[PDB]
Ligand binder design. Structure first.
Ligand SMILES: CCCCCCCCCCCCCC(=O)O[C@H](CCCCCCCCCCC)CC(=O)O[C@@H]1[C@@H](NC(=O)C[C@@H](CCCCCCCCCCC)OC(=O)CCCCCCCCCCC)[C@H](OC[C@H]2O[C@H](OP(=O)(O)O)[C@H](NC(=O)C[C@H](O)CCCCCCCCCCC)[C@@H](OC(=O)C[C@H](O)CCCCCCCCCCC)[C@@H]2O)O[C@H](CO[C@]2(C(=O)O)C[C@@H](O[C@]3(C(=O)O)C[C@@H](O)[C@@H](O)[C@@H]([C@H](O)CO)O3)[C@@H](O[C@H]3O[C@H]([C@@H](O)CO)[C@@H](OP(=O)(O)O)[C@H](O[C@H]4O[C@H]([C@@H](O)CO[C@H]5O[C@H]([C@@H](O)CO)[C@@H](O)[C@H](O)[C@@H]5O)[C@@H](OP(=O)(O)O)[C@H](O)[C@@H]4O)[C@@H]3O)[C@@H]([C@H](O)CO)O2)[C@H]1OP(=O)(O)O
Ligand SMILES: CCCCCCCCCCCCCCCCCC(=O)OC[C@H](COP(=O)(O)OCCN)OC(=O)CCCCCCCCCCCCCCCCC
Lengths: 563, 563
C-alpha cells in the first residue's frame, strides 16, 4: 500500500509539485517542438517564406533551453524528494534496529540488513519516483501528442487512438512474458551460482582427495548450464523488442495506408503528415513506459512492504519500571532455564548460580554450550523463557532495560570501536556529564595512556574503521578504559588474549586486577591466573553444571575440570 | 589486453561475422526507412500519386521484419559468442584456481573471488560485446546516415560533417566530467557505507553503554551525507544530457538556419528537408554511443586485467618427481620452522616431532597456535620456509604433490560435502577403479550405512547444497567412511566434536578406533578419551613444543598438561 509511504513524502510535497509541473512542461516542450514541423514544411518549404526559417532556429534553441532546464529541475527536485524520503525512512529504519533485540541480529537477519538500509530503501525511492517520472512525463507526452495530432489531423488521430490500446496491450503481454521466464529462471540462477560457490568452498578437500580433474569435469557442466541460461535471457529479452516494434509498425503501416484514402483522408499537407508521422515515432517510448510503470511501481512497493516488516516488528521489551542507582546487591540465578530462539535444544538446564557482591566467579571451559549464553542473560540480550535471574532481590524484567544494562559492563578482545575520539570512545553516552578529567584519570588508572599519549593526536584520535585501527590487546585495554569511570557493579570478561604481548601483559593484568579488585565480576576462563584469582569457580559442561566451589575442592576430585 | 583475449574469441569467430553482418543490416534497415520519407513527402503527398502510398506500408513492415530479424540474429549470435567466451574464460579460471596454493584462498582473496568466475568474467564480455554492437551498428548508422544526407542534400551535409566532430567533442568532455566526479565520489560512497556498516555490526555494546541516542545522532550525520552525495550524482548526471542536447540543438539550429539561404534552398524539396532533419535526430544515439565506446571497452579490458592476473599468478609448486605408492615410513620433522604467508610472526618455531607408524600423536595443546598449522604442513598446503619434514626417508618437495596428498586424509566434521551421490562422496576422485562393493563394505565398516540405509534414495541421494544437508556428526562419520575406503597411510584428525551426542557416539568412537587402529595418525586432541588413548602426547603452546611423551609422564611433570 502506497498510503503508508505517503506521510513520509508529505513534508516534501513542494518538490513533487515543482518537479511535477517541470515534467508536464518538459513533455510540452518536445511536443511543441514536433509541432514546429507543421510551419516548417508548409510555410517554409511549401509556400516559400524565409521568415519562418529565421525565427524557427530561435524557437528550436528556445524549446531546447526550456527542455534542458525543465529536465534538470525535474530530475533535481524529484531526487531531492527521493533523496530526503530515503534519508528519512532509512534513519527511521536505523532508529528501529537500535531497539530491536539481539536475537533479531543473531542470524535471523545477518549483516545483509546493511543492504536493507542502503539498497532496499534506495530501491523504494528510485522505483516510486521513477514511476512518477513515467506517469507525469510520459502521461503528459501521451496527452500532448494526442492534442497536436488531433489539432492537425483528426482523421489519422482517431485511428491512432484506436490502435494505441492495441499496441499497449501488445507491449503488456510481451513484457509480461519476459517477466515470467525471468522470475521463473531467478531460482535456477541462484542454484547454478551456489553450485559453483560450493565447489570453490571445498578447495582444500579437492586438493587432498585428488579431484582436480573430477571438479573440472563438474565445472564443465555448470558453466555450460550458466551459458545455456544466459542464452535464454537473450532468446527471451531480444525477441521482445523485435516483436514490440513490429506490432507497433503495423500501426505505422495502418495509419500510412489509411492516409492513401482519397477524400476523407489525404486532405493532409506535407507539414501535417510530417507532424503526425513523427509524433507516432515519439509515441513509442511513452507507450512503452506507461505500460510498464505498474511493473516498476510494484517493484518499489514490493520493497516498501519488505521494509515495513521491520517498522511493524516488535522491539526489545522494556516492560519494566524500576531504575537501579547502583547494583550493590548480589545477582543470583533462581530456577533459570533458557532456550535459544530459532532452535529447540536448550542451552541452559535448571540452574541456581549465585554471584556474590565483590567476589568474582569464573567460567572455566571453551564452549560449554551455554557459557557465553549465561553472560548474555545478565545483560538481557535474549529474554528469559522461564526462571528468574534475581538482581538485588528482584527479577531483571521488573527493571527498566537501560538502567539494567547500565549496571553491567562487558569487556572483550573483540570489542567494538566507534569512529569517534578516544575521549568519547572511553565515555560513550557519557560525554556530557562525565568531563575530560574523569576520562584522563580513568585512562591512566587502566594504564591505557602509555599507548594513547604517544599517538598522533592524543585523546582525539579516530580508532575504528577508516582510523588508526588499534591493537587486539589494545582492544581489551580500551575495553578496560570503557569499563572504567565506574557506575558498573557487574563486569563480564571473556579474555580472548591467546598470544600474550610481551611487556604489555604486565600492565594489562595489572589493570585487570584493578578491574576485579571490587564489584561483582563474572569472568569466563581461558587463563589459569584468572582461575586462581577467582573466588567461586563455576564450570559448565554440555550446557549444565554439576560441580561448583573453589579451586581446591575442584582439585580434590578431578572430573573433567582438572584435565 | 584484447590481443591476449582474441585467441579465446577466435574459435567463436563465425558468430561475430554473422552478427557483425546482421548489425550492419540492422543499421542499414532504419537508414533505408528514413530514406522512405523523401518519396513520401515529395512523390506521395506533394505529387498526389496513390501508387506510392500502397507500396510504402509494405516497406514500412518490410524494413521492420528485417530490423526485427537482424536485431534478434545479431543479439543471439553475439550473446552466443559472449556466452561461450565467458564459459571458456570461466572454465580456464577454474582450472587455474584448483591448482593455486591454499595461501591464495587464505585471506589473500576471500569468498568474493567467486565473483571473478561469475560477475567479472561476465563483465568483460558484456562490455567487449556491447562495445562491438556500438562500433558496428552505430558506426554503420553514422556511415549510412552520412551516405543518405550526401545523396539527398550535399549542401546540408558538409555542415553536418563539420558540426558532428564538435558535438562528438562536446559529448566526450561532458561525459568525461561525469566519469571524473563519479570515480572521485566512489571513495566517499565507500566511506559512508563503511561508516554505516560499523554501527550495525556493533548493536551489542551499544545497548550496554547506553548509546542508543548517540548512535541515532551519528546516523543523522551520515544519512545526511549519503543524501547530499546522491544529490551530487543528480546535479552532475542530470546536467550532462541537457548540456549535450542543447549543444546538439545548436547544431540543429545552425543547419536549420543554413537551409534558409537561397543557395541551399530551392534545391531542397519537401522530402529532402524531412530526411536530413529526421536522420539528424537519429544521428544523436549513434553519436552519443560512438563517443562512449572507449569508456565501455576500457571497462571491459580493465575488467579483463583483473582476471588475467589470476590467469598469470603462480600455481602451487609441484616441483617433485618421486611417487609414494604407500608410505609406511615414519614422518619425521627435522629442524622444521614455518611462518604464515601474509604475516611476520612465526606460527611454528624450530620443532622436531616424531610421528610413529600406527601410533597416535595427540596435540593436547590449544588456543590456535600451531595445531591447525601443522595439520596443513603435512599435506603441503603452505610450503615450508626452512627445515625438512621427512616422509618415508625424503622431504615432501622431492615427491609429486598429488601422490603426497593421496597418502594423507583429513577427517573432520567441518569437511566439505559435494553435490554428488553418497557413494561417489565416499569414493571421490576414484569411482571407476573403486567399485560399489568396496564402497558398501567401507560404509559398513564406518557404521554410517544405517543412516544412509534410512535415507531417501539409499546410496544415491544428493547431499551437498540444494540437498538433504546432513548432520554434523554424520559428516564426520562420512569422512570416516571416505578415509576408510581410500586407505590413507597417514591420518590427520582434528576432533571438532567436543560436544558429544547420544546414540551417535557409540558408533562414532567404534568407527574412529577402527580407523586409527593402524596408520601413522597424528590427531588434534580436544576430547579426553583420545587423549587417554594416545601413544606419544606432544604439547604445542604459542609456537613451540612444551612436553613430549606419554600422558603418565605428563601426569608426573604437569606443566600445561592439566591446563
Ligand atoms: C551533428 C548531429 C547533431 C544533430 C542532432 C540534433 C539534435 C536535435 C535534438 C537532439 C536530441 C533530441 C531530444 C530527444 O532525443 O528526445 C526526443 C523527443 C523529440 C525531440 C526532437 C524534436 C524534433 C526536432 C525539431 C526539428 C525541427 C523543429 C525523443 C527521446 O525520447 O530521446 C531519447 C530517446 N531517443 C529516441 O526516441 C529517438 C527517436 C526520436 C523521437 C521522435 C522525434 C521525431 C523526429 C523529428 C523528425 C523531424 C522531421 C522534420 O527516434 C528517431 O530516431 C526518429 C528518427 C526520425 C523519426 C522518423 C519520423 C520523422 C518524420 C516521419 C514522417 C516524415 C531514447 O530512445 C531509446 C532508443 O531505444 C530504441 O532503440 P532500439 O533500436 O530498439 O534498440 C529506439 N528504437 C525505435 O524507436 C524504433 C521504432 O521502433 C521505430 C518505429 C516505432 C513504431 C512506429 C510508430 C509506432 C506507432 C505507435 C502506435 C500508436 C531507439 O530509436 C532509434 O534509435 C531507432 C532509429 O534510430 C530510428 C527509427 C527508424 C524508424 C523510424 C522511421 C520510420 C519512418 C516512417 C516511414 C514512413 C531509441 O533511440 O531514449 C532516451 C532516454 O534514455 C537515456 C538517455 O538518453 O539519457 C539513455 C538510456 O539508454 C537507452 C538509450 O541508449 O537510448 C534508453 C533506454 O530507455 C532503452 O531505450 C535502452 C535501449 O534502447 C532499450 O532496448 O537504451 C538510459 O541510459 C537512460 C538512463 O540510464 C535513465 O533514464 O536515459 C531519450 O532521451 P531523454 O528524453 O532526453 O531522456
Ligand atoms: C496503462 C496503459 C497506457 C495506455 C496509453 C494509451 C493512450 C491512449 C490515448 C490517451 C490520451 C487521449 C487524449 C485525447 C486528447 C484529445 C484532445 C483534443 O481533441 O483536442 C484537440 C482540440 C482541437 O481539435 P480540432 O477541432 O481538430 O482543432 C480545431 C481548433 N479549434 O483542442 C485543442 O487543441 C485542445 C483541447 C484540450 C482538451 C484536453 C483534453 C485532455 C484529456 C485528458 C485525459 C486524461 C487521461 C486519463 C486520466 C484520468 C483522470 C481521472
Amino acid at each position: 500500500t502506497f498510503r503508508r509511504l505517503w506521510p513520509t513524502i508529505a513534508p516534501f510535497k513542494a518538490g513533487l509539485i515543482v518537479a511535477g509541473v517541470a515534467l508536464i512542461l518538459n513533455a510540452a516542450s518536445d511536443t511543441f517542438m514536433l509541432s514546429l514541423l507543421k510551419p516548417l514544411l508548409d510555410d517554409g518549404f511549401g509556400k516559400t517564406d524565409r521568415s519562418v526559417l529565421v525565427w524557427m532556429p530561435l524557437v528550436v534553441i528556445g524549446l531546447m533551453i526550456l527542455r534542458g532546464i525543465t529536465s534538470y529541475v525535474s530530475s533535481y527536485c524529484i531526487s531531492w524528494v527521493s533523496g530526503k524520503v530515503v534519508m528519512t525512512m532509512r534513519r527511521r529504519l536505523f532508529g528501529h534496529m537500535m531497539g530491536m533485540p539481539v536475537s533479531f541480529f543473531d542470524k535471523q537477519s545477518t549483516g545483509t540488513l546493511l543492504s536493507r538500509i542502503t539498497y532496499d530503501s534506495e530501491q523504494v525511492a528510485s522505483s516510486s519516483s521513477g514511476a512518477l517520472i513515467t506517469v507525469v512525463r510520459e502521461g503528459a507526452s501521451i496527452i500532448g501528442l494526442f492534442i497536436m495530432m488531433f489539432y492537425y489531423s483528426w482523421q489519422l488521430s482517431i485511428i491512432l487512438i484506436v490502435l494505441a490500446p492495441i499496441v499497449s496491450i501488445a507491449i503488456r503481454v510481451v513484457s509480461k512474458r519476459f517477466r515470467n521466464i525471468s522470475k521463473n529462471m531467478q531460482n535456477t540462477m541462484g542454484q547454478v551460482t551456489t553450485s559453483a560457490e560450493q565447489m570453490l568452498k571445498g578447495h582444500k578437500e579437492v586438493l587432498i582427495f585428488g579431484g582436480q580433474e573430477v571438479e573440472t569435469k563438474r565445472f564443465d557442466k555448470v558453466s555450460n548450464r550458466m551459458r545455456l541460461q544466459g542464452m535464454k535471457m537473450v532468446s527471451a529479452s531480444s525477441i521482445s523488442d523485435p516483436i514490440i516494434q513490429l506490432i507497433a509498425s503495423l500501426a505505422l503501416a495502418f495509419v500510412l495506408y489509411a492516409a492513401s484514402f482519397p477524400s476523407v483522408m489525404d486532405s493532409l499537407t506535407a507539414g501535417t503528415i510530417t507532424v503526425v508521422f513523427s509524433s507516432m515515432i515519439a509515441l513509442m517510448r511513452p507507450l512503452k513506459s506507461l505500460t510498464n510503470v505498474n511493473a516498476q511501481f510494484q517493484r518499489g512497493m514490493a520493497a516498501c512492504q519488505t521494509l515495513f516488516t521491520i517498522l511493524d516488528s516488535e522491539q526489545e521489551k522494556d516492560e519494566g519500571k524500576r531504575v537501579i542507582e547502583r547494583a550493590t546487591g548480589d545477582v543470583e540465578f533462581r530456577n533459570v532455564t533458557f532456550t535459544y530462539p530459532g532452535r529447540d535444544v536448550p542451552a541452559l538446564r535448571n540452574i541456581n548460580l549465585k554471584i556474590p557482591a565483590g567476589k568474582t566467579v569464573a567460567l572455566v571451559g571453551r564452549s560449554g554450550s551455554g557459557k557465553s549464553t549465561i553472560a548474555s542473560l545478565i545483560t538481557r540480550f535474549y529474554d528469559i523463557d522461564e526462571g528468574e535471574i534475581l538482581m538485588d532481590g528482584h527479577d531483571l524484567r521488573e527493571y527498566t532495560l537501560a538502567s539494567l544494562r547500565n549496571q553491567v559492563a562487558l569487556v572483550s578482545q573483540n570489542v567494538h570501536l566507534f569512529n569517534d575520539t578516544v575521549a568519547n570512545n572511553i565515555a560513550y553516552a557519557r560525554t556530557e556529564q562525565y568531563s575530560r578529567e574523569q576520562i584522563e584519570e580513568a585512562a591512566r588508572m587502566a594504564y591505557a595512556m602509555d599507548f594513547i599519549n604517544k599517538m598522533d593526536n592524543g585523546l582525539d584520535t579516530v580508532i575504528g574503521e577508516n582510523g588508526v585501527l588499534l591493537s587486539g590487546g589494545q582492544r581489551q585495554r580500551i575495553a578496560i578504559a570503557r569499563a572504567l569511570l565506574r557506575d558498573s557493579p557487574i563486569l563480564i570478561l571473556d579474555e580472548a588474549t591467546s598470544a600474550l604481548d610481551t611487556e604489555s601483559e604486565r600492565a594489562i593484568q595489572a589493570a585487570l586486577d584493578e578491574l576485579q579488585k571490587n564489584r561483582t565480576s563474572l569472568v569466563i576462563a581461558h587463563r589459569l591466573s584468572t582461575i586462581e584469582k577467582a573466588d567461586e569457580i563455576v564450570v559448565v559442561e554440555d550446557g549444565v553444571i554439576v560441580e561448583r566451589g573453589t579451586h581446591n575442592d575442584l582439585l580434590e576430585h578431578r572430573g573433567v575440570y582438572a584435565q
